[PDB]
Design a protein around this motif. Structure first.
Motif, short mmCIF file in Angstrom:
data_model
loop_
_atom_site.label_atom_id
_atom_site.label_comp_id
_atom_site.label_asym_id
_atom_site.label_seq_id
_atom_site.Cartn_x
_atom_site.Cartn_y
_atom_site.Cartn_z
N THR B 84 -19.40 -21.54 24.89
CA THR B 84 -18.62 -21.84 24.28
C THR B 84 -17.80 -23.02 24.64
N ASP B 86 -14.85 -22.78 26.51
CA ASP B 86 -13.63 -22.12 26.49
C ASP B 86 -13.53 -22.36 27.50
N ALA B 88 -9.70 -23.22 28.38
CA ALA B 88 -8.66 -22.39 29.08
C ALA B 88 -7.99 -21.13 29.16
N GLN B 94 -8.03 -11.99 21.68
CA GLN B 94 -8.81 -12.24 20.30
C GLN B 94 -9.33 -10.52 19.30
N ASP B 98 -12.13 -11.46 15.17
CA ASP B 98 -12.16 -13.36 15.19
C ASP B 98 -13.44 -13.67 15.95
N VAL B 99 -14.05 -13.25 16.36
CA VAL B 99 -15.12 -13.59 17.66
C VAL B 99 -17.02 -12.76 16.77
N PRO B 100 -16.77 -13.04 16.17
CA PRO B 100 -18.22 -12.62 15.52
C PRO B 100 -19.03 -12.81 15.66
N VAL B 101 -19.46 -13.73 16.67
CA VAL B 101 -21.08 -13.47 17.89
C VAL B 101 -20.80 -12.41 19.09
N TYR B 152 -27.40 -6.28 15.84
CA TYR B 152 -26.27 -7.84 15.20
C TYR B 152 -26.15 -8.53 14.12
N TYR B 156 -22.54 -9.33 12.97
CA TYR B 156 -22.09 -10.90 13.07
C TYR B 156 -21.34 -10.59 11.02
N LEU I 10 -2.76 -21.01 19.59
CA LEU I 10 -3.68 -20.82 20.95
C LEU I 10 -4.58 -21.65 21.21
N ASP I 11 -4.74 -21.86 23.09
CA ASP I 11 -5.53 -23.18 23.93
C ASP I 11 -6.73 -23.28 22.94
N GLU I 13 -10.91 -24.63 23.00
CA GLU I 13 -11.25 -25.20 23.91
C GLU I 13 -12.55 -24.76 23.14
N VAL I 25 -17.39 -19.30 8.13
CA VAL I 25 -16.78 -18.39 8.59
C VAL I 25 -15.58 -18.20 9.14
N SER I 27 -12.63 -17.27 10.72
CA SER I 27 -11.80 -17.50 11.95
C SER I 27 -12.59 -18.35 12.69
N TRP I 30 -10.78 -19.10 16.22
CA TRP I 30 -9.99 -18.43 16.32
C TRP I 30 -10.97 -17.12 18.27
N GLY I 31 -11.85 -17.67 17.96
CA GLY I 31 -13.14 -17.68 18.79
C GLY I 31 -14.62 -18.50 18.71
N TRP I 32 -15.70 -17.75 19.38
CA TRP I 32 -16.88 -18.05 18.89
C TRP I 32 -17.62 -17.35 17.35
N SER I 33 -18.39 -18.39 17.44
CA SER I 33 -18.34 -17.74 15.83
C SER I 33 -19.70 -18.33 15.38
N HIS I 34 -19.61 -19.39 15.55
CA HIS I 34 -21.05 -20.03 15.58
C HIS I 34 -22.83 -19.51 16.45
N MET I 35 -23.63 -18.84 16.66
CA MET I 35 -25.21 -18.94 17.13
C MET I 35 -25.80 -19.48 16.68
#
Ligand SMILES: CCCCCCCCCCCCCCCCCC(=O)OC[C@H](COP(=O)([O-])OCC(O)COP(=O)([O-])OC[C@@H](COC(=O)CCCCCCCCCCCCCCCCC)OC(=O)CCCCCCCCCCCCCCCCC)OC(=O)CCCCCCCCCCCCCCCCC
Ligand code: HEA
Ligand SMILES: CC(C)=CCC/C(C)=C/CC/C(C)=C/CC/C(C)=C/CC/C(C)=C/CC/C(C)=C/CC/C(C)=C/CC/C(C)=C/CC/C(C)=C/CC1=C(C)C(=O)c2ccccc2C1=O
Ligand SMILES: CC(C)=CCC/C(C)=C/CC/C(C)=C/CC/C(C)=C/CC/C(C)=C\CC/C(C)=C/CC/C(C)=C/CC/C(C)=C/CC/C(C)=C/CC1=C(C)C(=O)c2ccccc2C1=O
Ligand SMILES: CCCCCCCCCCCCCCCC(=O)O[C@H](COC(=O)CCCCCCC[C@@H](C)CCCCCCCCC)COP(=O)(O)O[C@H]1[C@H](O)[C@H](O)[C@H](O)[C@@H](O)[C@@H]1O
Ligand SMILES: CCCCCCCCCCCCCCCC(=O)O[C@H](COC(=O)CCCCCCC[C@@H](C)CCCCCCCCC)COP(=O)(O)O[C@H]1[C@H](O)[C@H](O)[C@H](O)[C@@H](O)[C@@H]1O
Ligand SMILES: CCCCCCCC/C=C\CCCCCCCC(=O)OC[C@H](COP(=O)(O)OCCN)OC(=O)CCCCCCCCCCCCCCC
Ligand code: HEC
Ligand code: HEC
Ligand SMILES: *C[C@@H](COC(=O)CCCCCCCCCCCCCCC)OC(=O)CCCCCCCC[C@@H](C)CCCCCCCC
Ligand SMILES: CCCCCCCCCCCCCCCC(=O)OC[C@H](C)OC(=O)CCCCCCCC[C@@H](C)CCCCCCCC
Ligand SMILES: *C(=O)CCCCCCCCCCCCCCC
Ligand code: FES
Lengths: 158, 160, 223, 163, 139, 100, 312, 54, 92
Positions: B84, B86, B88, B94, B98-101, B152, B156, I10-11, I13, I25, I27, I30-35
């Protein structure tokens, strides 16, 4: 499809010591040898009884039961033509019952063999059963019908 | 825990005779937290390798498995931050949606763990729920590759 | 007995000739030969109800008996007369001995069970899974005579424990252990079946985890 | 399973009947009954020997023609008696379960199936090496005695194996 | 509520007639008198229709002509507050899964599974019934 | 009938899911080693007794049919209630089309 | 034309079968006439295409025709009433209940095979003082002095004081024509005689059908307790020879294996057959000794093997 | 039972923190030790029911 | 009425510019959303290969091999359909 054409239950041999030989018009079921052995073998010259049940598959007959001899000179005391869509029971396997005290035709075709050769239980011995329709090799086993295990001598620790 | 210790029987060892190398039981499972290990043993298809005068038994595989499993569990946050990116200082949690993956990855991992755990119980599952033992073994074998993918995808789409 | 054999033949001619020839020789790929199976085999197989099998599958299951005790004896005597084999144990009266088959020793019976029976059934007589669609059923239901005859005749995928492997004394001992385990209450609360790790873990994850998480949701907030 | 005394007794081929399996152990004449203190410790060693247990299975005569043998183990069977190690070739659990009319030696630790008719080779489950077959025969007085040692190591495989 | 009532009184009348004729013609002209299976089934389906029709007639007498029951009714006549119609809910699937667990525990005789399924059914039915009444958390 | 929704729409969702899973469990007779219900669709009595067709396939068939039937009963309740109660202001019960 | 227009019914061999065939011919005539007129109507309204020459002029929009609907709801009542009358009269000639059947065959039909007992032979010309055995009907009344409890219960039995495993309903006879899985049971009957069939089922409800009779029945386990008229008579069997018979219900897995045969012979041939069956002789031997094939000639007890790809 | 609850609650806590992303920059080490901690628990459980020779 | 709008800093990066978008998607930030789809297709091919190779083992029966073949073929077909659609631009 555990119950398909190849199913475990249908293709099961009976849990009996004697072997089953379907070769020929007649079917040989529970063929075995009554031969109590007190040592490694049973010495040549000792009579051992030969059990089996002959069932005539077809109603059209193979009731002869000609010789059924092999190494050992099988002898069929009181030989008779019993099989007619029925059962020919040569002997009295341990547990076999008698309906009445009298026996028809005296013995019901008891089959005995003089070994002329050592045999021990746990082996396969070929007995060629001959019928007017044909002949079949069966490899008759040796069965201990109802005799309880003999007392093994107590062990002496060393 | 006290209510369970009273009303529920755990490990009735008296029914279980003293250990002998010859005596056996049909169940033969470990506690649920090692059932995933046992199921991984069961489902891995009997693959061995034979180098020059040496044997590499199929059991070796599970050890490697654990390694990878632990090697992936212990190290996961670093893989997450490497993929990712990230890096930070995150103090607000979360929501999994909000984090589908990552939600899909965690659902996949839970699915694989559950599949392995139930594979360890495939003996009892077959006994109680009438399914052939070979059928359960192969359900697990195909599942440890297919069920994670389906889970998965479903997780997702569910998070989105 | 003459009348007993007559009744056994009558019952046989209209319940199982399809699977086993009229001469008791097994029909090819339908049923095995009943010559030499013995009265013990018939008693165990029919009293448990397995024999009006009604299908060829991986494992013939136990089901309500299709014949009553007298008819069971008639069939068993018929088979015994035809081929001749193991006979169901009986007491002084003549009925199928069940109380008399409880061996006095249980620790020795327990060792015998664990070495021989537990291999596939369980530590405590529960069932077990077998190769492909087969299983070892639970021993709770089987009465002492049924357990004895099951040992004395290996029905299907059961090793046949002849009277020489397990002498009547050892068979009665194993029967005693089986009955004691089956009827003994599980000390320490509801015994979750007999399998430990699987029911125990399932009960943890249901009872203990649902309770703990529900209590956490009650104590804690949502946001 | 007698409580301590004579836990091991010599065995005879007639005892095992077609389609019957019995666990057997390597009992020596010196390892007499457990009556004395010197014995009852040798017997404990036999009982606790991991690789000591073997299963002797009497193949039904009707199934005899189906038996497929292993090179170097063609005479290990005494007639219709076959001695195969109980210890699984996979991780060394006992392979106690035996299925007659299908001749499947099943290991319950990981549900591994070996074909008893054909040399005890794994036909399902994790196991990949056949169970070691013990040579057997009958000695004087007709008692079943091993006809020699396993031609190969019998427990679960390890690095220094199959050479 | 009069038309859908009359429907059920017509059905009740026919079912009563059918049950009576079946009972009369089986009590005699049959080998063993009344069949006692078809007869009871006809009687209690007559009862089914009777209960539904009696309730419908009661309500119809209790209710003035609704727009839906009134010919020549303008759409504006029925316009107004309709009742609560449950929006999205995931409790029905959980109830279905709970009853399926109980059903498999019944088919496969697993008393533990039957008990677990019954507990799941009670929990899921509680969730559904309480879904739109659970007050906000008070902290 | 000019209605916004069915009478008890959570109930019809429950009916659909009860159906789906009841049908699934009934069909699950096949994965069992014995197989699915061998007795005819009609499943006449003595052939269905535990003596005849003792396999778990028959039990799964019975219970899956029970679950699907409960779903069907709930659906029927929902549809009859919707037709009698939920209807358009002008849609008299003799003016609703024949499919209703 | 009748055979082709009979939709493949085997021309009966009994008066009842012939009359049932005539009813079937008439009913098929009526059904085909109705179908032809309705198909004519459907295909001729299919000639009402939306011709492009028609402008924006929609059809008559008529609907709601009272007299035509009344006519076409009255007439079907007439057709079904006539069909019902013919059905009732033909049905009356299916269970005649002649108290003096020439031969009473006891068709006891057990899982995957049959058995015929020749319960009684009674020829009107005067012969055959024959009867079935019936010492073999033994009950299973579990009227033991006490059950598991010390006293009190003295349980009699589950059903009417007896056990379900009673089998009293089954009746056994001296001349049983049992069929094995490898031998098709051949029911020998006399031509030109009234043959009653007392139907019973040993294990599971199933069916008894002789297609050449154009009739069938369900052998139930205990018909008397099920309010079933298991027995049924056939007035005559003109045509001789062999005729297949099939189980027309669900016996079980080997339900298609239940095929049997009925070999109707001349009354003198039947007399000889019964004479040679009284003396100990199988059905095959008795049939052969009357110069008739021993095995079933319409059917064969086909392979007990589970299928073609089974490895023998 | 406490051992089983210990294991199950560790698994549930791990799932919570994983799905909620509580392992990010400030608290990787925590995760790491927690992972080790979980592992230890599992093994100790194995050594627990293995203590009574059964 | 007892609720208040929330706002979170939210930070943030990678710079969440390549891959997924909020429209696909909601959100994404807001977080990891792409594979990546590449890892999709590679993993699917690896799954199919694993399914095939499990045909090699210790199992005399062949229903098992046929089920493996069917499942691997299904996976390969799904991956091929997805790859073809992506290459053509989600057409057909
Ligand atoms: C075997 C014998 C067991 C028999 C037990 C059944 C008892 C139920 C009758 C109670 C009366 C009732 O349902 O009134 C509805 C009544 C009115 O619904 P509501 O939500 O209050 O009203 C708001 C809207 O209608 C809500 O709008 P909506 O769209 O949700 O409508 C759904 C609602 C309202 O819908 C209706 O009222 C329509 C009519 C259908 C309801 C009746 C069917 C429920 C039972 C079916 C199970 C078969 C048995 O009905 C339900 O709540 C459905 C219940 C789900 C059951 C599914 C089982 C699988 O519901 C309740 O308030 C109480 C319901 C509680 C039911 C308890 C069931 C537990 C039984 C298990 C005990 C274990 C023993 C056996 C082992
Ligand atoms: C709605 C009910 C319904 C429908 C549509 C059908 C449709 C068909 N039926 Fe029907 N049938 C019954 C209900 C039905 N049947 C009943 C109730 C019985 C009696 C049962 C009993 O005796 O117990 C019966 C009995 C029955 C028998 C007698 C079996 C026996 O008892 O010995 C036969 C024999 O051919 C048959 C054939 C067919 C055929 C050829 C079709 C065709 O119309 C079917 C059309 C085929 C398809 C639509 C399949 C094509 C699809 C694929 C190839 C894709 C598959 C892919 C996946 C599954 C992923 N049916
Ligand atoms: C590797 C692997 C997983 C192979 C497959 C083995 C497996 C798990 C097969 C599925 C088992 C099932 C569900 C059998 C029922 C028949 C069937 C398959 C129907 C179709 C399935 C399907 C999708 C139906 C639609 C609706 C649906 C989801 C139904 C599921 C029905 C069930 C069983 C729900 C509950 C799930 C459940 C609790 C399963 C059992 C899990 C375990 C390990 C229980 C352990 C356990 C046991 C074994 C006891 O004996 C016991 C005795 C006394 C107290 C406690 C217990 C106890 O906890
Ligand atoms: C596990 C995870 C989130 C990983 C994230 C991604 C990651 C780090 C990947 C790398 C690691 C790898 C290689 C993972 C693949 C396989 C894997 C997970 C291996 C490690 C196994 C391990 C040490 C831990 C996994 C345990 C775990 C997190 C389980 C899920 C916990 C949760 C949230 C469960 C739901 C909450 C809840 C109400 C549970 C009770 C209800 C029930 C019955 C749930 C199902 C259920 C469960 C969960 C049992 O454990 C169980 C055990 C024995 C018998 C039956 C059951 C059973 O029915
Ligand atoms: C969470 C778990 C979810 C499951 C995940 C995995 C999903 C992937 C499913 C993969 C399916 C693979 C099926 C193939 C399997 C296979 O290859 O084996 C066969 C047997 O096929 C079968 O049964 C078909 C079984 C298919 C059913 C799969 C259904 C899915 C279920 C399990 C989903 C419910 C999950 C509920 C979970 C509860 C919640 C969890 C928290 C033959 O064996 P056998 O029996 O020995 O037959 C001999 C011949 O070989 C030989 O020739 C012949 O001669 C004969 O002798 C014969 O005996
Ligand atoms: C906070 C924890 C609360 C726990 C509740 C505690 C309940 C205390 C129960 C009463 C005192 C202890 C009883 C000990 C005596 C005892 O053990 O209880 C047996 C019963 O056992 C069964 O059958 C099951 C019967 C069904 C009712 C009990 C089900 C309770 C479950 C649902 C609770 C645990 C959670 C599991 C959820 C899993 C679901 C997953 C979704 C009863 O005898 P029986 O029935 O005959 O057992 C057969 C021998 O006979 C025969 O030989 C033998 O061979 C067998 O056949 C044996 O079954
Ligand atoms: C849709 C059309 C699918 C196809 C539909 C056809 C269904 C017919 C299947 C069974 C009928 C009953 C027969 C049952 C008997 C088994 C057959 C047989 O006789 O062949 C002998 C061996 C063991 O005999 P062996 O001597 O011990 O060993 C031999 C020594 N080398 O079995 C075998 O090869 C097993 C081969 C059986 C065919 C495979 C069926 C599975 C296909 C699953 C497809 C699903 C795809 C999933 C998609 C995600
Ligand atoms: C359908 C095929 C049947 C029928 C109707 C009967 N049997 Fe028999 N039988 C059948 C099979 C497939 C097997 C082997 C596997 C199994 O038992 O489920 C057997 C076996 C027996 C045995 C066991 C012999 C032994 O263990 O040595 C006996 C004693 C036996 N069968 C007898 C028997 C009787 C008395 C029946 C009528 C009550 C009967 N069977 C019916 C197949 C089938
Ligand atoms: C896996 C090999 C195996 C071993 C070894 C074995 N069993 Fe079994 N057992 C089975 C199988 C398979 C059945 C199913 C019998 C059937 O289907 O007819 C069974 C059935 C039984 C039954 C019948 C119970 C019932 O309700 O039908 C009893 C009792 C029993 N076994 C006890 C024992 C005893 C005692 C021993 C030790 C002498 C033993 N078993 C050893 C596999 C085994
Ligand atoms: C005997 C051989 C031959 O079998 C065949 O020829 C037919 C094979 C049909 C293909 C079976 C595919 C299985 C699909 C699994 C569904 C996906 C699961 C993943 C999600 C958990 O084969 C056999 O040995 C027996 C074959 C018997 C096949 C019966 C299949 C019954 C399925 C039933 C358990 C319900 C499955 C749930 C599906 C849910 C779908 C909606 C969510
Ligand atoms: C646990 C770790 C597993 C590490 C194995 C290390 C193997 C080294 C020895 C291999 C060997 O030479 O033995 C002979 C072999 C048995 O026969 C063959 O030569 C034909 C082999 C055909 C298939 C090969 C597939 C190999 C894939 C592995 C390299 C992947 C491991 C990850
Ligand atoms: C095994 O013992 C039973 C074999 C059953 C043979 C008939 C196979 C029918 C398969 C129907 C399809 C099942 C559902 C498929 C869902 C994907
Ligand atoms: S322990 Fe024997 S198969 Fe693994």
């Amino acid at each position: 499809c555990s119950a398909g054409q190849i199913s475990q239950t249908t293709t099961q041999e009976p849990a009996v010591n004697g072997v089953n030989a379907q070769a020929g018009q007649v079917s040989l079921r529970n063929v075995h040898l009554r031969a109590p052995q007190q040592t490694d073998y049973v010495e040549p010259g000792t009579t051992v009884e030969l059990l089996f049940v002959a069932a005539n598959d077809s109603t059209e007959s193979n009731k002869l039961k000609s010789i059924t001899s092999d190494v050992g000179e099988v002898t069929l005391t009181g030989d008779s033509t019993v099989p007619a869509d029925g059962v020919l029971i040569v002997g009295e396997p341990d547990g076999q019952i008698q309906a009445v005290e009298n026996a028809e035709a005296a013995d019901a075709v008891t089959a005995e063999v003089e070994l002329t050769k050592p045999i021990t239980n746990g082996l396969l011995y070929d007995f060629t059963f001959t019928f007017e329709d044909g002949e079949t090799t069966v490899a008759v086993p040796i069965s201990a019908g109802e005799q309880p295990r003999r007392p093994v001598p107590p062990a002496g620790p060393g | 825990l006290g209510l369970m210790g009273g009303l529920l029987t755990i490990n009735p060892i008296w029914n279980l005779g003293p250990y002998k190398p010859s005596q056996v039981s049909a169940g033969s499972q470990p506690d649920f937290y090692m059932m995933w290990t046992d199921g991984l043993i069961r489902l891995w298809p009997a693959w061995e390798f034979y180098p020059f005068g040496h044997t590499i038994p199929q059991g070796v595989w599970v050890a490697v498995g654990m390694g990878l499993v632990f090697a992936l569990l212990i190290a996961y946050p670093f893989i997450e931050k490497k993929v990712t990116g990230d890096d930070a200082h995150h103090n607000l949690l979360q929501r999994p949606r909000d984090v589908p993956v990552r939600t899909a990855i965690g659902s996949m991992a839970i699915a694989l763990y559950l599949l392995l755990t139930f594979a360890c119980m495939n003996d009892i599952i077959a006994l109680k729920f009438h399914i052939s033992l070979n059928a359960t073994t192969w359900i697990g074998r195909i599942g440890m590759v297919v069920l994670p993918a389906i889970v998965y995808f479903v997780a997702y789409r569910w998070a989105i | 007995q003459s009348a007993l054999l007559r009744t056994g033949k009558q019952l046989f001619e209209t319940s199982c000739v399809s699977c086993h020839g009229a001469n008791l020789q097994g029909v090819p790929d339908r049923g095995p030969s009943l010559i030499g199976t013995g009265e013990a085999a018939v008693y165990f197989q029919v009293s448990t109800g397995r024999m009006p099998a009604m299908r060829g599958e991986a494992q013939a299951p136990s089901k309500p008996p299709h014949f009553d005790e007298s008819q069971i004896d008639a069939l068993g005597a018929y088979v015994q007369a035809n081929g001749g084999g193991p006979t169901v144990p009986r007491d002084d009266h003549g009925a199928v001995a069940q109380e008399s088959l409880i061996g006095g020793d249980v620790a020795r019976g327990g060792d015998l069970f664990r070495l021989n029976c537990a291999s596939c059934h369980n530590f405590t007589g529960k069932g077990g899974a077998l190769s492909s669609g087969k299983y070892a059923p639970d021993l709770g239901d089987a009465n002492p005579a049924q357990i004895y005859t099951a040992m004395l005749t290996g029905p299907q995928n059961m090793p046949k424990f002849s009277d020489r492997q397990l002498t009547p004394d050892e068979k009665r001992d194993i029967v005693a252990y089986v009955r004691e385990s089956a009827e003994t209450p599980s000390y320490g609360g509801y015994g979750l079946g007999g399998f430990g790790p699987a029911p125990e873990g399932m009960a943890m994850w249901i009872i203990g985890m649902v309770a703990a998480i529900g209590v956490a949701m009650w104590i804690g907030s949502r946001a | 399973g007698r409580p301590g005394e004579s836990p091991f007794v010599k065995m005879r081929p007639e005892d095992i009947d077609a389609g019957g399996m019995e666990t057997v152990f390597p009992w020596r004449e010196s390892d007499g009954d457990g009556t004395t203190v010197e014995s009852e410790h040798k017997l404990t060693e036999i009982a606790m020997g991991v690789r000591n247990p073997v299963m002797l299975i009497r193949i039904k005569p009707a199934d005899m023609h189906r038996v497929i043998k292993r090179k170097g183990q063609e005479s290990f069977n005494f007639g219709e008696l076959f001695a195969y190690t109980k210890v699984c070739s996979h991780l060394g659990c006992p392979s106690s379960l035996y299925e007659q009319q299908t001749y499947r030696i099943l290991c319950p630790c990981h549900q591994s199936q070996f074909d008893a008719l054909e040399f005890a080779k794994p036909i399902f489950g994790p196991a990949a090496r056949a169970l070691a077959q013990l040579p057997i025969t009958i000695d004087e007085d007709g008692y079943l005695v091993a006809n020699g040692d396993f031609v190969e190591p019998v427990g679960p495989a390890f690095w220094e194996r199959k050479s | 509520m009069h038309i859908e009532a009359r429907l059920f009184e017509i059905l009740t009348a026919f079912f009563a007639l059918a049950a009576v004729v079946y009972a009369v013609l089986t009590a005699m002209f049959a080998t063993g008198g009344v069949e006692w299976a078809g007869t009871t089934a006809l009687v209690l389906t007559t009862g089914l229709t009777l209960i539904t029709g009696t309730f419908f007639r009661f309500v119809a007498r209790r209710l003035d002509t609704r727009p839906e029951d009134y010919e020549d009714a303008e759409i504006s006549d029925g316009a107004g507050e309709l009742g609560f119609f449950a929006p999205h809910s995931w409790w029905p699937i959980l109830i279905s899964l709970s009853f399926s667990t109980a059903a498999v525990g019944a088919a496969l005789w697993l008393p533990w599974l039957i008990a677990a399924g019954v507990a799941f059914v009670i929990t899921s039915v509680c969730g559904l019934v309480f879904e739109y009444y659970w007050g906000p958390e008070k902290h | 009938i000019g209605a916004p929704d069915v009478a008890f729409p959570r109930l019809n969702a429950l009916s659909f899911w009860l159906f789906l899973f009841g049908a699934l469990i009934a069909i699950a007779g096949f994965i069992t080693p014995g197989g699915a219900a061998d007795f005819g669709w009609t499943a006449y009595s003595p052939l269905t007794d535990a003596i005849h067709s003792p396999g778990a396939g028959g039990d799964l068939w019975i219970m899956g049919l029970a679950v699907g039937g409960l779903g069907t009963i709930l659906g029927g309740v929902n549809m009859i209630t919707t037709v009698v109660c939920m209807r358009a202001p002008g849609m008299t019960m003799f003016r609703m089309p024949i499919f209703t | 034309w009748s055979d082709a227009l009979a939709l493949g019914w085997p021309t009966g061999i009994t008066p009842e079968a012939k009359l049932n065939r005539e009813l079937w011919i008439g009913s098929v005539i009526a059904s085909f006439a109705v179908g032809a007129i309705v198909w004519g109507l459907i295909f001729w309204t299919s000639a009402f295409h939306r011709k492009k020459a028609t402008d924006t002029e929609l059809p008559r929009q008529f609907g709601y025709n009272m007299p035509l609907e009344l006519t076409l709801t009255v007439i079907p009542f007439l057709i079904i009433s006539v069909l019902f009358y013919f059905t009732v009269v033909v049905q009356e000639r299916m269970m005649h209940k002649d108290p003096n059947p020439e031969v009473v065959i006891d068709v006891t039909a057990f899982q995957w095979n049959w058995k015929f007992g020749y319960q009684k032979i009674a020829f009107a010309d005067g012969s055959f003082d024959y009867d079935g055995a019936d010492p073999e009907r033994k009950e299973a009344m579990t009227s033991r002095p006490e059950g598991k409890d010390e006293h009190g219960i003295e349980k009699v039995g589950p059903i009417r004081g007896m056990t379900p495993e009673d089998r009293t309903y089954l009746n056994f006879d001296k001349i049983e024509t049992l069929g094995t899985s490898s031998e098709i049971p051949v029911l020998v009957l006399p031509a030109g005689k009234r043959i009653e069939f007392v139907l019973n089922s040993a294990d599971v409800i199933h069916g008894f059908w002789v297609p050449e009779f154009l009739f069938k029945r369900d052998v139930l386990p205990e018909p008397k307790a099920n309010n079933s008229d298991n027995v049924f008579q056939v007035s005559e069997i003109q045509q001789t020879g062999a005729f297949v018979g099939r189980c027309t219900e669900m016996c079980g897995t080997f339900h298609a294996m239940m095929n049997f045969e009925v070999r109707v012979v001349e009354p003198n041939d039947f007399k000889a057959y019964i004479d040679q069956r009284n003396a100990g002789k199988t059905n095959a031997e008795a049939l052969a000794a009357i110069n008739q094939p021993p095995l079933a000639i319409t059917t064969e007890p086909f392979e007990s093997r589970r299928g073609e790809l089974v490895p023998q | 039972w406490a051992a089983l609850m210990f294991a199950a609650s560790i698994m549930v806590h791990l799932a919570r923190i994983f799905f909620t992303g509580a392992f990010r920059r400030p608290r990787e080490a925590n995760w790491v030790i927690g992972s080790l901690l979980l592992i230890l628990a599992m093994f100790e459980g194995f050594f627990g029911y293995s203590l009574p020779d059964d | 009425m007892s609720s208040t709008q929330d706002r979170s800093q939210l930070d943030p990066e990678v710079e969440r510019h390549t891959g997924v978008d909020v429209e696909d998607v909601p959100s994404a930030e807001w977080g990891w959303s792409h594979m990546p789809i590449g890892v999709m297709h590679i993993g699917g091919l690896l799954s199919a290969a694993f399914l095939l190779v499990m045909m090699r083992g210790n199992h005399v029966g062949h229903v098992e091999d046929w089920f493996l073949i069917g499942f691997a073929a299904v996976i390969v077909a799904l991956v091929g359909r997805n790859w073809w659609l992506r290459r053509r631009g989600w057409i057909r």
